[PDB]
Amino acid sequence: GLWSWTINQMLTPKFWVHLRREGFIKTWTRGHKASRHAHYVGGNRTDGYTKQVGEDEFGNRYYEDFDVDHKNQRRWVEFSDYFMQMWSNGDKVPVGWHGWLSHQYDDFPTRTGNSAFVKHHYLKQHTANLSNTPLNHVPQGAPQNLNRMRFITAQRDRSRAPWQSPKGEGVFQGKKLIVASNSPFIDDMSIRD
């Protein structure tokens, strides 16, 4: 990952401003967090670098630059996890930032203040694709489910519930076998008066 900032891209006022303000580790790694173009690191311009439109609950940074050579490269995100080339995929962008980054709308989430997005009490946090991990989606009757029998038995019992046969030693009156009734309803006409 050598030359995240090329020599021609260095000596630019943008690079020195970024290094003076942000530091070295943050400045150098900006070429690793996003790998769009050599001349695009920190923004297309040269006088200064693009201000981030926002940040993320996972640390990702979101920028929008209006001086890109093609219209489709206006908005981009730099990820907090950049361990390898071909490591950060597109499922790490949260909900509101997803719509902002896909140009569905021009609103973006904000940590504090007047928000354009609802914040209900039952909302869950965005999760990446969990396939090929121990936390994938398992149908209730699939063999991977350890409690698959409770779902199978209920589906069977919806239309055919087997009669529970007497087990073990029982009480006999001649040949009839005596057990207590299994009705949860009350025979009120035998207790009423």
């Binding site: 006022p13 943008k14 401003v17 303000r21 923004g43 311009r45 006088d47 200064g48 670098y49 693009t50 201000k51 929008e64 630059d65 209006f66 001086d67 021009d106 928000s115 609802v118 914040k119 209900h120 009490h121």
Partner: protein, 56 residues
């Protein structure tokens, strides 16, 4: 959870019950909006169109 046809007290009570900190509502503010049809809130995109830069 409720439209303007309900009293501000009922709307505030329901919103407090469902734990709604965002979009605060006051009985003075809800009274003016009570029984009133209004368009959606709007914003403005002000020209010139440019990039926001950081320098110095």
């Amino acid at each position: 959870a409720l439209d303007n046809s309900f009293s501000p007290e009922n709307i505030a009570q329901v919103q407090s019950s469902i734990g709604d900190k965002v979009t605060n509502i006051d009985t003075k503010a809800l009274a003016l909006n009570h029984q009133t049809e209004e368009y959606h809130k709007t914003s403005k995109l002000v020209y010139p169109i440019r990039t926001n830069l950081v320098v110095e």
